[PDB]
């Protein structure tokens, strides 16, 4: 939901 959402946005961000 979030803590991901900070990582996320440097994983699928990272690819998207």
Same mark, same amino acid.
């Given at each position: /939901? %979030? !803590?991901? !959402? #900070? #990582? %996320?946005? /440097? /994983?699928?961000? #990272?690819?998207?």
């Amino acid at each position: /939901r %979030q !803590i991901k !959402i #900070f #990582f %996320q946005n /440097r /994983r699928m961000k #990272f690819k998207k």
